[PDB]
Design an enzyme around this catalytic site. Sequence first.
Site, PDB file in Angstrom:
ATOM      1  N   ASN A   1      53.173  60.571  21.318  1.00  0.00           N
ATOM      2  CA  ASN A   1      52.969  59.413  20.454  1.00  0.00           C
ATOM      3  C   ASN A   1      53.690  59.466  19.118  1.00  0.00           C
ATOM      4  O   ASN A   1      53.273  58.822  18.151  1.00  0.00           O
ATOM      5  CB  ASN A   1      51.479  59.128  20.267  1.00  0.00           C
ATOM      6  CG  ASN A   1      50.742  58.897  21.574  1.00  0.00           C
ATOM      7  OD1 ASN A   1      51.298  58.447  22.578  1.00  0.00           O
ATOM      8  ND2 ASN A   1      49.456  59.195  21.553  1.00  0.00           N
TER       9      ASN A   1
ATOM     10  N   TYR B   1      54.223  61.932  16.946  1.00  0.00           N
ATOM     11  CA  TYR B   1      53.807  62.838  15.893  1.00  0.00           C
ATOM     12  C   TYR B   1      54.771  64.036  15.830  1.00  0.00           C
ATOM     13  O   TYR B   1      55.840  63.988  16.431  1.00  0.00           O
ATOM     14  CB  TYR B   1      52.304  63.145  16.013  1.00  0.00           C
ATOM     15  CG  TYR B   1      51.531  61.853  15.859  1.00  0.00           C
ATOM     16  CD1 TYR B   1      51.309  61.297  14.612  1.00  0.00           C
ATOM     17  CD2 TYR B   1      51.143  61.124  16.971  1.00  0.00           C
ATOM     18  CE1 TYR B   1      50.646  60.093  14.486  1.00  0.00           C
ATOM     19  CE2 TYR B   1      50.502  59.901  16.840  1.00  0.00           C
ATOM     20  CZ  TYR B   1      50.246  59.408  15.595  1.00  0.00           C
ATOM     21  OH  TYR B   1      49.637  58.196  15.433  1.00  0.00           O
TER      22      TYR B   1
ATOM     23  N   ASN C   1      55.672  55.031  16.819  1.00  0.00           N
ATOM     24  CA  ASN C   1      56.156  55.945  15.778  1.00  0.00           C
ATOM     25  C   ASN C   1      57.636  56.257  15.885  1.00  0.00           C
ATOM     26  O   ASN C   1      58.113  57.276  15.413  1.00  0.00           O
ATOM     27  CB  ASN C   1      55.293  57.195  15.699  1.00  0.00           C
ATOM     28  CG  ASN C   1      53.954  56.918  15.055  1.00  0.00           C
ATOM     29  OD1 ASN C   1      53.830  56.032  14.202  1.00  0.00           O
ATOM     30  ND2 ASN C   1      52.956  57.687  15.429  1.00  0.00           N
TER      31      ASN C   1
ATOM     32  N   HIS D   1      48.750  68.081  20.922  1.00  0.00           N
ATOM     33  CA  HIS D   1      49.330  66.734  20.858  1.00  0.00           C
ATOM     34  C   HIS D   1      50.834  66.856  20.672  1.00  0.00           C
ATOM     35  O   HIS D   1      51.301  67.186  19.575  1.00  0.00           O
ATOM     36  CB  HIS D   1      48.702  65.955  19.703  1.00  0.00           C
ATOM     37  CG  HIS D   1      48.988  64.489  19.730  1.00  0.00           C
ATOM     38  ND1 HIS D   1      49.791  63.891  20.674  1.00  0.00           N
ATOM     39  CD2 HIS D   1      48.456  63.491  18.993  1.00  0.00           C
ATOM     40  CE1 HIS D   1      49.760  62.585  20.479  1.00  0.00           C
ATOM     41  NE2 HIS D   1      48.967  62.323  19.458  1.00  0.00           N
TER      42      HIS D   1
ATOM     43  N   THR E   1      41.543  58.347  17.865  1.00  0.00           N
ATOM     44  CA  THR E   1      41.320  58.309  16.424  1.00  0.00           C
ATOM     45  C   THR E   1      40.506  57.086  16.052  1.00  0.00           C
ATOM     46  O   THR E   1      40.802  55.967  16.466  1.00  0.00           O
ATOM     47  CB  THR E   1      42.681  58.266  15.740  1.00  0.00           C
ATOM     48  OG1 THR E   1      43.304  59.534  15.916  1.00  0.00           O
ATOM     49  CG2 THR E   1      42.617  57.977  14.255  1.00  0.00           C
TER      50      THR E   1
END
Lengths: 399, 399
Positions: free
Chosen positions: B194, B196, B251, B191, B37
């Site tokens: 991480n 999410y 996260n 994904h 990103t």
Amino acid sequence: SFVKDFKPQALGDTNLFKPIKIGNNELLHRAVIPPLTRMRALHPGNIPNRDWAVEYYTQRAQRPGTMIITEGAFISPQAGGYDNAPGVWSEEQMVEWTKIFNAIHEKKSFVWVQLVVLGWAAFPDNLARDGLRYDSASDNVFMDAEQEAKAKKANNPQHSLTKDEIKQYIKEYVQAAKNSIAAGADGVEIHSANGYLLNQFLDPHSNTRTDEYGGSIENRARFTLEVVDALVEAIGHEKVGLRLSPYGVFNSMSGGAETGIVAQYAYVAGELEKRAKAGKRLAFVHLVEPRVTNPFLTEGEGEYEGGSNDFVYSIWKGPVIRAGNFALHPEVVREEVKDKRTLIGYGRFFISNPDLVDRLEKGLPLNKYDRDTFYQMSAHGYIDYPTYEEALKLGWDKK
Amino acid sequence: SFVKDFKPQALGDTNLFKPIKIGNNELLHRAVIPPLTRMRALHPGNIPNRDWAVEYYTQRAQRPGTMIITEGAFISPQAGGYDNAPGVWSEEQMVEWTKIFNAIHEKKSFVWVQLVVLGWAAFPDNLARDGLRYDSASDNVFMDAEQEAKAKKANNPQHSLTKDEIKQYIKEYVQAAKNSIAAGADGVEIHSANGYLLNQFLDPHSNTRTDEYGGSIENRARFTLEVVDALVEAIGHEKVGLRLSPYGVFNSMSGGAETGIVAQYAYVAGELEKRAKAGKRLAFVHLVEPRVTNPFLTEGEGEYEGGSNDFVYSIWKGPVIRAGNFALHPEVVREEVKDKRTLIGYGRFFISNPDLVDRLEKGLPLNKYDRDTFYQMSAHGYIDYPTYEEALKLGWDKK
Ligand SMILES: Cc1cc2nc3c(=O)[nH]c(=O)nc-3n(C[C@H](O)[C@H](O)[C@H](O)COP(=O)(O)O)c2cc1C
Ligand SMILES: Cc1cc2nc3c(=O)[nH]c(=O)nc-3n(C[C@H](O)[C@H](O)[C@H](O)COP(=O)(O)O)c2cc1C
Ligand SMILES: C=C(C)c1ccc(C)c(O)c1
Ligand SMILES: C=C(C)c1ccc(C)c(O)c1
Ligand SMILES: [Cl-]
Ligand SMILES: [Cl-]
Ligand SMILES: [Cl-]
Ligand SMILES: [Cl-]
Ligand SMILES: [Mg+2]
Ligand SMILES: [Mg+2]
Ligand SMILES: [Mg+2]
Ligand SMILES: [Mg+2]
Ligand SMILES: [Mg+2]
Ligand SMILES: [Mg+2]
Ligand code: NA
Ligand code: NA
Ligand code: NA
Ligand code: NA
Ligand code: NA
Ligand code: NA
Ligand code: NA
Ligand code: NA
Ligand code: NA
Ligand code: NA
């Protein structure tokens, strides 16, 4: 004779020869005697052999500070089904076990009783003769066709345990553990390996249950963990270990062919670590390596190369005993014991080498074993394997 | 400038420089661009940057036969919540993505779109502005206090998804995958890493659900596996990969502190292998290493030493991409690529070295990265990092 083509290596300069504490016991080296069924117990009553068992264990306790795990011992009649394997439920049994434990302790070594429930590996006709069930996790999958047929012929078809019957086994594990400690043992090992009853619950091939004891990873692990918890409560975590064989196929377990097998065993390891972090760390986890998926195949056969037990070390942070084809592979041992919480179990070559530990330290030739007397009702192939000194006197250096 | 204390090693003599097929793509080397990103997409509409994105990807595609995974791309408005990250749901977005994919293909390289749903990592105020929910697995555990408070202030408290809303996300994954392929991408990466949304379902800290999507290993993995299956059906297994970060804490995921974490990820790997053995093998599994538990900490920080990803290789038998602090550690790469199905993702140093692959082959100095421009609305720190030749012309060998 000595093993002919073997090139020994002295392992005295490795952590195999560094002391380590396991439970209450200060081991002086990390060569462990794994559980080895020898079938010298006498019928009736599954009595440890009154003539030879003390000598067998005394011989193998000779290196001070050795950890010995006994041959598998049945927790009750219903848990058994082999007439010549011992139990730990009766006074007469325990009279003999007390002598064995005292002898091991006189040699400054330690003894842990392996607690066994056979499940579908038992002989259904022996059980029927004695008025006992033929038990497993399920009633619709069988160890093999011969076992299924024997059970039917004996009017003793394989029975899927009820929750009550699971609880009764748990009560028997508890009492067997108490008996073992009261008779002088240093601890117990819960056998959850090699396709016996607890492993039959862990494995999705053998466990097709749809109640709380099957149908998911957590459910398949439930019985094993209930036994762990019951024994920890009864005799303390420092007196309890657990044996697992993630990649085993002996007794019709799945091994690596089951894609969920690592997850199943990772879950068990994680639950042990959770208990440890909460203040109740088992003395050890004992793993059979994928090096030996079936211990009745010659070393080098039945090796699974598609998996490793290393995952357990990411999860469980206590001592780990590893067993499987290590005697003939000192080069592998040298690497594995670089990990400071790893111990090595030596099975078949402890059968044939009562002084194995000295031989490992000093890099001496190993006595060949005689598979024909692994299970025999005899002193021969039990208590008459020589020490290295005795073998030299017999001229084995020239055979 | 070049990284000052780095001692490069030429990796041309390793499997990093052996070709390998991933999905439909014949890679010429095994240095992969992981998803990164960069926050150059423009608002409104989450549009890939019309001025610079083609050049950014063209630069990084310069070594023929490179696999590039795009920056994370939102599958729908509800899946987003960062104004300057791109989406793959709209015609305008796809106009720009098509140019990017064409440019990468003109350089004889390959491109896989990473498909993202943010869950609790999204900004709740952006979502509220746009009339969208703030979603996660649960409604009673939050990423951090600031996120919880922002959501409340925006009258958009964190919402635990209904089964219907999970199904709607699945429909959006499917359509986003279709859009990506139709626009020319070689494949997609799901994904599930991480921290999410999918990771929020995998992790027992963030997932306190008591329905079929939480409360057990199988249940926590359900949403991830439904997305896998939906995409395999829609566009084919050869066009789908999956990203996981077992030991991540970014996260507010659990990492190794959760004793059940290896089991959770072993289960996912096993289910992928089961699908593979049944004829639908994903193109790859992409793992973030415990080397980097949080990618916004400097290399060497946030390293978890208590676990390894090696367990995945006992279970999943296809290609594995590993990412995390490998650029500064060619000595580690040299060992990992001895495994013939291992690829290495290089993140932060691909930001700063458009010609990283040449530098890895030849053992050249690496351009230092500028973390301040990782997320910035600028060509600076995006498309103006020099190749090695350009850096020499700038005198960086003498800075
Ligand atoms: C004759 C024999 C008896 C065994 N009995 C038992 C037993 O009672 N309990 C057990 O858990 N494993 C038992 N095993 C398995 C061993 O403990 C060990 O895991 C296996 O033999 C591999 O180690 P090795 O290659 O050093 O022999 C037995 C193996 C043999 C050959
Ligand atoms: C600026 C930045 C952006 C990233 N964006 C993403 C992303 O969109 N998706 C993703 O899965 N990981 C993302 N990551 C994680 C990286 O793909 C990678 O796993 C991590 O940076 C570790 O590899 P490295 O040490 O080579 O940078 C990002 C990391 C950084 C530093
Ligand atoms: C308890 C017995 C009879 C036994 C025998 C062999 C093995 C491998 C085992 O685990 C247990
Ligand atoms: C899609 C985005 C915004 C993103 C950013 C950073 C990381 C580590 C990631 O996995 C995803
Ligand atoms: Cl021989
Ligand atoms: Cl018998
Ligand atoms: Cl520097
Ligand atoms: Cl934003
Ligand atoms: Mg019946
Ligand atoms: Mg090893
Ligand atoms: Mg003979
Ligand atoms: Mg609410
Ligand atoms: Mg490695
Ligand atoms: Mg600056
Ligand atoms: Na030697
Ligand atoms: Na005698
Ligand atoms: Na390890
Ligand atoms: Na036999
Ligand atoms: Na003899
Ligand atoms: Na070099
Ligand atoms: Na410009
Ligand atoms: Na491996
Ligand atoms: Na930021
Ligand atoms: Na500059």
